[PDB]
Amino acid sequence: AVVKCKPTSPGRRHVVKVVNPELHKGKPFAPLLEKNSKSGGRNNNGRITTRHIGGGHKQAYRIVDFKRNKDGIPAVVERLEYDPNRSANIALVLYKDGERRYILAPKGLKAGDQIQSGVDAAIKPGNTLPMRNIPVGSTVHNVEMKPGKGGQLARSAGTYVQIVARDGAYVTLRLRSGEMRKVEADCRATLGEVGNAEHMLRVLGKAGAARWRGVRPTVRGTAMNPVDHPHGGGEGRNFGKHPVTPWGVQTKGKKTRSNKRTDKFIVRRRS
Amino acid sequence: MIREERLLKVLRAPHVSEKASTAMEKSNTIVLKVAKDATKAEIKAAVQKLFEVEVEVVNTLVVKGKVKRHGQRIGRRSDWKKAYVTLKEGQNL
Amino acid sequence: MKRTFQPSVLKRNRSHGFRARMATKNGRQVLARRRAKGRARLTVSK
RNA sequence: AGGACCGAACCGACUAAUGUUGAAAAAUUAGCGGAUGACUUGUGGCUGGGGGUGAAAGGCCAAUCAAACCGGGAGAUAGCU
RNA sequence: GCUCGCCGGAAGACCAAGGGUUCCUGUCCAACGUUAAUCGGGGCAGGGUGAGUCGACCCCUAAGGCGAGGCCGAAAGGCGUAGUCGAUGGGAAACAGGUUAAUAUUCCUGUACUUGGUGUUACUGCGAAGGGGGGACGGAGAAGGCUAUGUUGGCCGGGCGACGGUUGUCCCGGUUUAAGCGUGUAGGCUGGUUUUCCAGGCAAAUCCGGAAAAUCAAGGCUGAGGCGUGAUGACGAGGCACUACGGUGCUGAAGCAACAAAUGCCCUGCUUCCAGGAAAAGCCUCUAAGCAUCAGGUAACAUCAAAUCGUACCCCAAACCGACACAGGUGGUCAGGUAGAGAAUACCAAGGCGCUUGAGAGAACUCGGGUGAAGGAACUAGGCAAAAUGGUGCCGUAACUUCGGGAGAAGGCACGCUGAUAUGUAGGUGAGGUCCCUCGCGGAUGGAGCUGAAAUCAGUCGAAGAUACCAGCUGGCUGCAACUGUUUAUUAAAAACACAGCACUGUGCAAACACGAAAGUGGACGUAUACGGUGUGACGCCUGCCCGGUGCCGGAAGGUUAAUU
Structure with a gap:
C-alpha cells in the first residue's frame, strides 16, 4: 500500500511510504545471513572511488538464490521478507527435502504458493526454466546471461524481460532499458515480473x-x-x-x- | 624439583624495615629481597631448604628504582623484588 | 582549548616504535641514519 | 509518530562589554542556537602532498596551506637593497 | 583551637587515559614558590605498592594490518590466498568486617566460589579442523513488579537548657549488616512425548531440517526482588582509660515497622516502527577417521596447582594536554536533605576548600554592579546596550493556511497563611482477622495503620502571596531562502552549501565511472523501479521563440588525409 504522511512536521509533509502488510515482522532466517560491512565507497587503496557513499543503517546480507538449481524438487513459499540489500522483496521458500532458500519475490507470489525449477516445470510465475523451454512472448525476470552463472538481468523491484524471439541457440530479449539483446537459449529465467x-x-x-x-x-x-x-x-x-x-x-x-x-x-x- | 644451584641464587637479603618487623611480630611473615626473575615456587623451595622453616605462602611485588641526582647528574636505582613469606605459626625465623 | 598533542602510548608505539621502523626499508633507513649520527635513543620505544 | 515543541547535561558560537606586553598565540562575563538526530562522544583503524579530505569557505591535513613538514640539489638565482 | 566565609550533579568521591615517586616519615630553606616561609608537588635521606577470584597476560574474533605459496610490477615494491595478528566488543571464579604513617575485594578475621592436573570407586561409546544449536545483537515507546535510597513512627541511649517558656503530641543521636547457599516468586517465552520414513545440512550422523502417525494435557526454559540462612558473629550511639593529647586501649543498648521511591534492576523482556539492526570462540549436540573388554568419556571422593606482570600517588587537575603552581581543554562511574517538573535553581549534608603578596587610603579616570526627579528613543548608522516580559491553572484568541498550523497568537482572571467541609477529604498503600485451597512467595473478602493532593466556603496579615534564585517582550508591513541541517578552527553563519523533489544524460554487467604502469579494488556480493555524472532546488501555477555559432548525437556518397607499400 502507498500511504501519504500527515504534515505534523515539515520533514513529514512530503513523505510517501510503501507499506506491504504481508512482509514478515520477525527476524530473517539466520542460516542464510552474512555480515556485510560498509565501504564508504573507498577501494583497497583507501581512496574514494565512488562519491556520495557513507553512513546509513547497518545491514545483514541475505544469501539469495539467483541460480535456482534444485530442479525437479517442488518448494512451498513460507513467507515474504524485507531485504535491505535490494529494492525487491524476497521469499523464504521450503523445499520438500527440508532445504530453505531465499528467492526474489515475483509479482503475485504469496505464502503457500508452489514453485518449481527445471526443464519440466509448469509455466506459471515463480517457476524457473531454461529459456529454450519458455514460449516466445513470455514475461520473465532474473534472467541468466551465461548458462549456470545465475540471474543477472531484471532483478530490481517491478522489472521484467520479454522474450521477443527464438533463433537457433539464442533468444532475442527486450530489456527494461528498451535494448534488444541475444542470450543463449540454455540460459535460465524465472516466469513473471519482480x-x-x-x-x-x-x-x-x-x-x-x-x-x-x-x-x-x-x-x-x-x-x-x-x-x-x-x-x-x-x-x-x-x-x-x-x-x-x-x-x-x-x-x-x-x-x-x-x-x-x-x-x-x-x-x-x-x- | 628446583636445583640447589638456583635456590642458592634466588635469595639476596632480609629486608629490614618497621613494616617488616611488624609483619614478623603480627603475621609470622619474613620480608626478603629476592632475584628479579625468582618465582613464588622458587622462593618457597629456597626458604624451605636453606632456613629449614615451613612456608605457608609467598607474596611478591616489584619495587621500582628511584630516579636520583649525584652531583647534578641524573641516575636511577635498580628495580628489585620483595617477597612476603608467611611461615606456619611456629617456625620463628 | 584542545591542543595538538593528545598522548596515547599504543598509538605512539604503532606509528613511531622500533617494530614500525623495522617493518619497511625507509624506516630501516631512519634507524641507519640515527645510528650513524650516534643517537642515544633510536626510537620512541625506550 | 516526529531531521515535532519548551528546557539542563552535552554539542555549538548570533550580540555586546572586558581583555589586546591577556588569566588565555582566540578566552572570560551577561545574554544566544541545537538538544531522539543529517545528533553527540570514547577507543582503534584507513585515505599522504599536485596527493588526501571537503553538506564547497580554497576550508582542513599537528598554533604551518592557491600546494604540509624534514633533509638533500644548495653557497638556486637576485640587472635589486 | 574557636569563630567567619565559599563549593556541594562539585570546588566531594572513585576510575580509565596520560604522567611516573609527585605517595608517607624525618631533616634542610641556597635556588625553585610571582611576597615572607618555620611551609611545599622544592633539596636530601629512609620507607611504602603483597591477588587462583581486580586488571593485563590468556582463548575468541571486528574494522584494519601483515601475509607461505600465488598474481602483478624497470629495481624498490603493489595486491592478495592459506594463514596469522589486531579491542574499542564476546569468554571461569569473592564478599563483608578489621588493620598501616603510607597497600589492600591483594594483608588478617569470618564465610565463599572457579578452572585444570593427577589418583579412587561407579557406570559407560569415545572421538574433528567437518555438520547442527547456541552465543547473537536496531530504534522508539509503554507500563507493571521491584530495589538503591529517603521520610516518619516505634525502639534504645543520652538530655531538662547562658534569656520568657520547655516532663512534653519536647530536644539530640543511633536504628547497619555482603558475596554465597536454600527457596523459583511478580513476570516473559515455547505445547510437550514417542515411533516410522526422507532428492536437504561438502562425507556420515542417533544431531538439525522436513513429511507422517499415535498420545497427552501440563512439561521445559528464562526470571528481578522478597523470605530463610550466612550472623549465638561483625558493626554499633555512647561510655570508661590511657595518652608520647597524636590516636589508640577497654566495653557497648536498640538494631523494628509503615510509607514514598528512581534515569538502577526484571528488561538481551513486552508493544511497535522502518532506516531491518557484528563476528568468532568458550558452551551444548552430532557423527567421520580412529579405538575397539583399551585409551577416551560421565558422576561422587581425595590430592596438587592456578604462574608472570600491574597495584604507591595525581587524575575536570599545581602531578595529564596547554613554554608557567596558566580563569582554557580532558572519556566513564557515584548521586543525600528542604523547596522545586527537574541532574535547573536557592540554601545545606557527607566531604572539600578561602583560589601563595599583604597593609592603608576612600581623588580624577577605568572596570563590574545598585538606585534615580521630570521627560521617554529626543540617543544612534541601527533601541547597540540596558530596562522590560517571564510560573501554574483556567477563560479567551485574528489575517492567512499546504488544514498540521499560525498559537504560549493577542489579552485577561486566580494565586500567601489559618480554619471548616473532612478531629486528613478524593485517591494510593495496605496489617490482623475470616473463607477457600489442584496446599503455597496462593487466591477472595476484609478493612486497622500509614500516606495524601486539589477544590470550595469562611476568616486573616502585608504596599506587594508565580514575593527570593529561577522564569517568553508583544504586535503590524515587506525582501531572501521552502523547511531541520552545513560553512570560512582564529574578524564573514548568510540570501552562501546541503536538502527532499524535478529534469537531462551516460551505463546491458568483466556496466558506465573512479583509484591503480599492472595485478587488482571500489561501483556491488548491486543489475535500468539500478548505478554514475550534470544542472535545478519543498510545494502551487507554470516553463514561450531560436540549431546561425560552439559542443554532443547520428550519417556514409564526394573531397582532403598518417604510418605502410
Missing part, C-alpha cells in the same frame, strides 16, 4: 531519509572553485563551459560504451 512494483512511488520527504540509505550529499561543480572542478569559479553565478564530469568528460550526450567483445550480443541499442 514484485514490489510500488517501490518507485515512495517519496523520502527529507534529507535525513537519504542519509539512512548511506547516500551522502552531492555538491554541484558550479558551487566549487576552479582547482576542484572544471565548472568551478566565477564572481556570482557563472557557467559558460560545456557540462563535464569532475574528470573533464562531457556529461550531456557523450556515449561511453566501448566493449567490442559484447557488441555482437546487442541487436538494437536502448535509444
Whole structure:
C-alpha cells in the first residue's frame, strides 16, 4: 500500500511510504545471513572511488538464490521478507527435502504458493526454466546471461524481460532499458515480473531519509572553485563551459560504451 | 624439583624495615629481597631448604628504582623484588 | 582549548616504535641514519 | 509518530562589554542556537602532498596551506637593497 | 583551637587515559614558590605498592594490518590466498568486617566460589579442523513488579537548657549488616512425548531440517526482588582509660515497622516502527577417521596447582594536554536533605576548600554592579546596550493556511497563611482477622495503620502571596531562502552549501565511472523501479521563440588525409 504522511512536521509533509502488510515482522532466517560491512565507497587503496557513499543503517546480507538449481524438487513459499540489500522483496521458500532458500519475490507470489525449477516445470510465475523451454512472448525476470552463472538481468523491484524471439541457440530479449539483446537459449529465467512494483512511488520527504540509505550529499561543480572542478569559479553565478564530469568528460550526450567483445550480443541499442 | 644451584641464587637479603618487623611480630611473615626473575615456587623451595622453616605462602611485588641526582647528574636505582613469606605459626625465623 | 598533542602510548608505539621502523626499508633507513649520527635513543620505544 | 515543541547535561558560537606586553598565540562575563538526530562522544583503524579530505569557505591535513613538514640539489638565482 | 566565609550533579568521591615517586616519615630553606616561609608537588635521606577470584597476560574474533605459496610490477615494491595478528566488543571464579604513617575485594578475621592436573570407586561409546544449536545483537515507546535510597513512627541511649517558656503530641543521636547457599516468586517465552520414513545440512550422523502417525494435557526454559540462612558473629550511639593529647586501649543498648521511591534492576523482556539492526570462540549436540573388554568419556571422593606482570600517588587537575603552581581543554562511574517538573535553581549534608603578596587610603579616570526627579528613543548608522516580559491553572484568541498550523497568537482572571467541609477529604498503600485451597512467595473478602493532593466556603496579615534564585517582550508591513541541517578552527553563519523533489544524460554487467604502469579494488556480493555524472532546488501555477555559432548525437556518397607499400 502507498500511504501519504500527515504534515505534523515539515520533514513529514512530503513523505510517501510503501507499506506491504504481508512482509514478515520477525527476524530473517539466520542460516542464510552474512555480515556485510560498509565501504564508504573507498577501494583497497583507501581512496574514494565512488562519491556520495557513507553512513546509513547497518545491514545483514541475505544469501539469495539467483541460480535456482534444485530442479525437479517442488518448494512451498513460507513467507515474504524485507531485504535491505535490494529494492525487491524476497521469499523464504521450503523445499520438500527440508532445504530453505531465499528467492526474489515475483509479482503475485504469496505464502503457500508452489514453485518449481527445471526443464519440466509448469509455466506459471515463480517457476524457473531454461529459456529454450519458455514460449516466445513470455514475461520473465532474473534472467541468466551465461548458462549456470545465475540471474543477472531484471532483478530490481517491478522489472521484467520479454522474450521477443527464438533463433537457433539464442533468444532475442527486450530489456527494461528498451535494448534488444541475444542470450543463449540454455540460459535460465524465472516466469513473471519482480514484485514490489510500488517501490518507485515512495517519496523520502527529507534529507535525513537519504542519509539512512548511506547516500551522502552531492555538491554541484558550479558551487566549487576552479582547482576542484572544471565548472568551478566565477564572481556570482557563472557557467559558460560545456557540462563535464569532475574528470573533464562531457556529461550531456557523450556515449561511453566501448566493449567490442559484447557488441555482437546487442541487436538494437536502448535509444 | 628446583636445583640447589638456583635456590642458592634466588635469595639476596632480609629486608629490614618497621613494616617488616611488624609483619614478623603480627603475621609470622619474613620480608626478603629476592632475584628479579625468582618465582613464588622458587622462593618457597629456597626458604624451605636453606632456613629449614615451613612456608605457608609467598607474596611478591616489584619495587621500582628511584630516579636520583649525584652531583647534578641524573641516575636511577635498580628495580628489585620483595617477597612476603608467611611461615606456619611456629617456625620463628 | 584542545591542543595538538593528545598522548596515547599504543598509538605512539604503532606509528613511531622500533617494530614500525623495522617493518619497511625507509624506516630501516631512519634507524641507519640515527645510528650513524650516534643517537642515544633510536626510537620512541625506550 | 516526529531531521515535532519548551528546557539542563552535552554539542555549538548570533550580540555586546572586558581583555589586546591577556588569566588565555582566540578566552572570560551577561545574554544566544541545537538538544531522539543529517545528533553527540570514547577507543582503534584507513585515505599522504599536485596527493588526501571537503553538506564547497580554497576550508582542513599537528598554533604551518592557491600546494604540509624534514633533509638533500644548495653557497638556486637576485640587472635589486 | 574557636569563630567567619565559599563549593556541594562539585570546588566531594572513585576510575580509565596520560604522567611516573609527585605517595608517607624525618631533616634542610641556597635556588625553585610571582611576597615572607618555620611551609611545599622544592633539596636530601629512609620507607611504602603483597591477588587462583581486580586488571593485563590468556582463548575468541571486528574494522584494519601483515601475509607461505600465488598474481602483478624497470629495481624498490603493489595486491592478495592459506594463514596469522589486531579491542574499542564476546569468554571461569569473592564478599563483608578489621588493620598501616603510607597497600589492600591483594594483608588478617569470618564465610565463599572457579578452572585444570593427577589418583579412587561407579557406570559407560569415545572421538574433528567437518555438520547442527547456541552465543547473537536496531530504534522508539509503554507500563507493571521491584530495589538503591529517603521520610516518619516505634525502639534504645543520652538530655531538662547562658534569656520568657520547655516532663512534653519536647530536644539530640543511633536504628547497619555482603558475596554465597536454600527457596523459583511478580513476570516473559515455547505445547510437550514417542515411533516410522526422507532428492536437504561438502562425507556420515542417533544431531538439525522436513513429511507422517499415535498420545497427552501440563512439561521445559528464562526470571528481578522478597523470605530463610550466612550472623549465638561483625558493626554499633555512647561510655570508661590511657595518652608520647597524636590516636589508640577497654566495653557497648536498640538494631523494628509503615510509607514514598528512581534515569538502577526484571528488561538481551513486552508493544511497535522502518532506516531491518557484528563476528568468532568458550558452551551444548552430532557423527567421520580412529579405538575397539583399551585409551577416551560421565558422576561422587581425595590430592596438587592456578604462574608472570600491574597495584604507591595525581587524575575536570599545581602531578595529564596547554613554554608557567596558566580563569582554557580532558572519556566513564557515584548521586543525600528542604523547596522545586527537574541532574535547573536557592540554601545545606557527607566531604572539600578561602583560589601563595599583604597593609592603608576612600581623588580624577577605568572596570563590574545598585538606585534615580521630570521627560521617554529626543540617543544612534541601527533601541547597540540596558530596562522590560517571564510560573501554574483556567477563560479567551485574528489575517492567512499546504488544514498540521499560525498559537504560549493577542489579552485577561486566580494565586500567601489559618480554619471548616473532612478531629486528613478524593485517591494510593495496605496489617490482623475470616473463607477457600489442584496446599503455597496462593487466591477472595476484609478493612486497622500509614500516606495524601486539589477544590470550595469562611476568616486573616502585608504596599506587594508565580514575593527570593529561577522564569517568553508583544504586535503590524515587506525582501531572501521552502523547511531541520552545513560553512570560512582564529574578524564573514548568510540570501552562501546541503536538502527532499524535478529534469537531462551516460551505463546491458568483466556496466558506465573512479583509484591503480599492472595485478587488482571500489561501483556491488548491486543489475535500468539500478548505478554514475550534470544542472535545478519543498510545494502551487507554470516553463514561450531560436540549431546561425560552439559542443554532443547520428550519417556514409564526394573531397582532403598518417604510418605502410
